[PDB]
């Protein structure tokens, strides 16, 4: 998945991940935005 989680690092969309995308899901950062992984 995509959020409009702007990032420096994948630090910041953990959170959100963790939210509401999965159980042990996972963020990372290209071009300023998250790629959030749902699993």
């Known amino acids: 998945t995509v ?3 702007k990032c ?3 630090k ?3 959170p959100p991940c963790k939210a ?3 159980i042990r899901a996972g963020a990372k950062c290209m071009n300023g935005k ?3 992984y749902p699993h």
Do not use: E, N, R, Y
């Open 20 to 22: 509401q995308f999965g």
């Open 8 to 10: 420096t690092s994948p």
């Open 34 to 36: 998250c790629k959030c």
């Open 3 to 5: 959020i409009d989680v």
């Open 12 to 14: 910041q969309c953990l």
